[PDB]
């Protein structure tokens, strides 16, 4: 959410079916397990899948690039309560290159120069608004992204006019259960049934 991946999926579906979107890049997801999304993906022109397994989506792609698991990656995860926790790699990447390395070489080809994870963290600190201070954050301790504060809106809300926006909501039916799209989650669910 904090890096801007907040566009709704219905826009992607409409842009696929309106002919405006011609290529898709899927990183770690499996939308093709469901028939309607598979039919939508079949109307593409070029599809890349980054995934650990040869899943249903990667079979129908034009190019598949392997990924490493959470035991082989160095980085950070942002908790639900805005806490940034370090993720440390236990074993060396069994495919040869980490995901960060793959993205770094691709951006190197496209003309953006990064060397290691320190440069990426400095860029995150200097470009993402609320992660200012990630460069010397020392993720071995408690780090929260809004000015290292546990509580939000202590001095007013963060809207345009510093006021809460109240809008009327209509009638709402019964909740519709969400689906699982991450390949690791569905893999765990299917592997539960093996025993």
């Amino acid at each position: 959410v904090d890096m801007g991946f907040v566009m709704p999926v219905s826009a992607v579906a409409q842009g696929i079916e309106s002919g405006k979107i011609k290529a898709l890049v899927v990183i770690g997801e499996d939308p093709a397990a469901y028939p309607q999304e598979s039919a939508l993906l079949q109307k593409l022109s070029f599809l890349v899948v980054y995934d650990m397994f040869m899943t249903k989506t990667a079979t129908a792609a034009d190019m598949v690039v392997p990924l490493v698991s959470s035991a082989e990656v160095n980085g950070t995860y942002t908790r639900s309560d805005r806490r940034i926790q370090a993720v440390r790699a236990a074993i060396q990447p069994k495919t040869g290159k980490a995901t960060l390395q793959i993205l770094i070489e691709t951006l190197k080809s496209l003309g953006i120069k990064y060397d290691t994870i320190a440069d990426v963290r400095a860029a995150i600190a200097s470009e993402v608004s609320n992660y200012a201070g990630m460069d010397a954050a020392d993720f071995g301790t408690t780090v929260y992204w809004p000015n290292n504060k546990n509580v939000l809106y202590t001095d007013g809300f963060a809207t345009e006019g510093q006021k809460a926006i109240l809008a009327a909501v209509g009638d709402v039916p019964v909740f519709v259960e969400k689906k699982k799209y991450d390949s690791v989650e569905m893999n765990f669910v299917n592997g539960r049934q093996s025993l």
Partner: protein
């Protein structure tokens, strides 16, 4: 067994874990009793077993004549960059959508955003995130206004949804805290009752 301190990669509670491994094989996962409360759920405890799977991919493959051909990393990088550039050239701006999974670290998500910026597109999305929780339009930030560490001192906790079934370590913490927790009734599924 050698031990490495990481965090769980399955939901947003983000429990700290110790991965116990010997060489290139992960053998077990234990809770981190020093830096956290030391609780885990089934997904955190028994979920890293995909790191030892033999069906994981090892090298990138490019489709020719309907069959996947193993290629080097440099050839894969060239192919994906040139095909993306060809799509951009043939169909102009906003023809490429970048679908990611929320399991990636902060640096990989930032680099995927940089790649989306560099290929002249604004369509960055996720099927899991699917537009956020809707709290952003009201208060400005799509984030929790309080941390988990403040569940100990509250005198009343109202739970909406299946908090126990989906994020059970949070339920363990709430039960051990002893505060008065009241669940929203199930027979109130429409928002007219919220009105």
């Amino acid at each position: 067994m050698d031990s490495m301190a990481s965090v769980c990669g399955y939901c947003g509670v983000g429990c700290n874990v110790n991965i116990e491994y010997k060489g290139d094989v992960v053998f077990r996962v234990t809770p981190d009793r020093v830096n956290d409360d030391g609780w885990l759920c089934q997904r955190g405890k028994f979920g890293l077993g995909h790191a030892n799977d033999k069906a994981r991919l090892t090298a990138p493959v490019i489709k020719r004549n309907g069959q996947f051909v193993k290629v080097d990393w440099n050839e894969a990088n060239l192919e994906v960059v040139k095909r993306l550039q060809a799509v951009v050239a043939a169909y102009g701006k906003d023809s490429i959508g970048v679908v990611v999974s929320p399991r990636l670290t902060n640096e990989e998500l930032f680099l995927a955003g940089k790649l989306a910026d560099a290929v002249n597109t604004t369509i960055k999305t996720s099927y899991s995130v699917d537009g956020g929780s809707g709290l952003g339009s009201v208060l400005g930030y799509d984030a929790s206004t309080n941390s988990f560490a403040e569940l100990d001192n509250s005198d009343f906790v109202l739970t909406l949804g299946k908090v126990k079934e989906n994020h059970p370590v949070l339920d363990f913490k709430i039960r051990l805290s002893g505060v008065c927790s009241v669940a929203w009734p199930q027979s109130l599924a429409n928002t007219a009752d919220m009105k």
